[PDB]
Design a protein around this ligand. Structure first.
Ligand SMILES: CCCCCCCCCCCCCC(=O)SCCNC(=O)CCNC(=O)[C@H](O)C(C)(C)COP(=O)(O)OP(=O)(O)OC[C@H]1O[C@@H](n2cnc3c(N)ncnc32)[C@H](O)[C@@H]1OP(=O)(O)O
Ligand SMILES: O=C(Nc1nccs1)c1cccc2[nH]c(-c3ccccc3N3CCNCC3)nc12
Length: 426
């Protein structure tokens, strides 16, 4: 039983909903708490200066996450997000200085807590809105189980609402309230020996180090020409590539995609915001289509679908007209091998956004897998989001442990398949 999440505008696990509907859970533009939340005595909030990668805040944040952020259930691996990754993930177009939220010990200046939000644009069925993604919630291990997390969550919620934004998207590797979808982790082994040394996999009794290497090999027998890293001048072409992809998989009519309800212009009024509610005749009207996804304008594309060594890899395929027709992308996160003082980290690729128009998605992922290998990634990870299950099904991906639950704050979304979701969080 929750004591915090039961009070919040989210669909609860006990939820009995007559129908599949979309829309705001509450329209409360003026009634939220505006006063800063109290921390334990001796602690203080600060706006985390991630705007200069050399700053002390950035160093403190890197250290806090390195030692206290997400681990696997068995505490064998912990994420080790680089500063360059964090800068790409958090200093996004439109970001607010006050959406990077730190907790400091006044006596020692030690940073003991962090939470962040980034602005994104999203379509949800027939509505479009500016919203927030909350990520990198982190509390020092020595401060856990003291109910600080809700304080951090309440404070970031306040700071988002001060920007006239009343919804948020977030994921969790555990069930909290009722998730609108559940993603499954899949892993493609690239560097067998490194991952054996790290304990990520073992050597089966019916196999050898060498048979294992042969089995997990990325095939090269069939390559696809025309792929190159994206550059900044591709942004307009990439942007249109995404519009086309989302138009292709829309779950509303063409007239509706072109005339989405802009929740930003109506969320100040209980009466007008009602417009955003939508009943859905049948959940099968959504089958095989995308219902919620991020929207990118050209400045977003320039930032997200770029190439930064050891952070983000974006390739596009040109046709004979030198028009961009396909795109793959993946970001790179190192993980600490918690119990291995000698080989201490592994470099993992994570599928981001992928668009196949002139090749199959399987062919695209195969080109991306080779590129990830050539980027010194030890494994390639993906979720069964969008059309990825097509690649995962008939492949050498191995299932991960646990599941990734998707949440939206203060919005109703029926429970949907992850194929219907085009939201990737870092
Ligand atoms: C309008 C805008 C809205 C924006 C807000 C949108 C919501 C954003 C939501 C946050 C999005 C996070 C997105 C990411 O970054 S997911 C990554 C989360 N980070 C980690 O797992 C890092 C390692 N772990 C930690 O640092 C701590 O364990 C954390 C800080 C996670 C919990 O610290 P601690 O273990 O000491 O717990 P507590 O005693 O203080 O408090 C327990 C209460 O807090 C709820 N809880 C615990 N963990 C989570 C969690 N991961 N999401 C949501 N709620 C969580 C819990 O249900 C319980 O409440 P209730 O069950 O009694 O009700
Ligand atoms: O250690 C871990 N993964 C390792 N893969 C190879 C060696 S170690 C790992 C540990 C905890 C949570 C994890 N979630 C995932 C993951 C897997 C596949 C697709 C997406 C994923 N996440 C990444 C973080 N944000 C949400 C989405 N991985 C991990």
């Amino acid at each position: 039983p929750h004591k915090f999440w039961n009070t919040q505008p989210v669909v609860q696990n006990d939820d009995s909903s007559s129908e599949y509907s979309f829309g705001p859970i509450e329209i409360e533009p003026d009634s939220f708490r505006k006063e800063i939340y109290k921390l334990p005595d001796g602690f203080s909030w600060f706006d985390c200066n991630l705007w200069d990668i050399e700053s002390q805040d950035f160093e403190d944040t890197y250290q806090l996450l390195k030692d206290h952020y997400v681990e696997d259930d068995d505490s064998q691996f912990r994420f080790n997000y680089s500063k360059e990754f964090l800068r790409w993930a958090l200093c996004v177009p439109g970001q607010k200085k006050n959406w990077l939220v730190g907790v400091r010990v006044n006596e020692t200046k030690k940073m003991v807590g962090f939470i962040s939000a980034i602005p994104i644009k999203v379509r949800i069925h027939n509505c479009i809105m500016n919203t927030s993604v909350v990520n990198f919630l982190c509390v020092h291990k020595k401060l856990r189980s003291k109910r600080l997390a809700p304080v951090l969550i309440k404070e970031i919620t306040r700071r988002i609402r001060c920007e006239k934004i009343f919804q948020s998207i977030y994921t969790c590797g555990k069930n909290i309230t009722k998730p609108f979808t559940i993603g499954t982790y899949w892993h493609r082994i690239i560097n067998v020996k490194k991952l054996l040394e790290a304990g990520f996999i073992g050597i089966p009794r019916n196999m050898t180090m060498s048979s294992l290497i042969k089995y997990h090999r990325i095939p090269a027998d069939k390559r696809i020409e025309g792929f190159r890293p994206s550059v900044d001048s591709d942004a307009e072409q990439i942007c249109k590539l995404f519009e086309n992809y989302f138009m292709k998989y829309k779950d509303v009519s063409n007239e509706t995609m072109n005339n989405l309800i802009n929740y930003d212009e109506i969320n100040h009024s209980k009466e007008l915001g009602k417009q955003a509610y939508m009943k859905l005749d049948k959940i099968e009207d959504l089958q095989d289509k995308i219902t919620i996804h991020q929207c990118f304008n050209v400045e977003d594309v320039k930032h997200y679908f770029t190439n930064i060594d050891k952070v983000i890899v974006t390739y596009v395929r040109e046709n004979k007209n030198k028009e961009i027709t396909d795109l793959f992308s993946f970001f790179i996160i190192e993980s600490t091998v918690i119990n291995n003082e000698r080989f201490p980290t592994i470099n993992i690729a994570y599928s981001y956004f992928n668009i196949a128009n002139t090749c199959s998605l399987k062919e695209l992922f195969n080109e991306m897998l080779i590129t990830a290998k050539n980027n010194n990634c030890d494994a390639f990870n993906t979720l069964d989001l969008m059309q990825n299950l097509q690649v995962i099904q008939d492949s050498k991906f191995i299932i991960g442990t646990g599941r990734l639950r998707y949440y939206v704050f203060n919005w109703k979304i029926p429970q949907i398949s992850p194929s219907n979701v085009g939201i990737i969080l870092f």
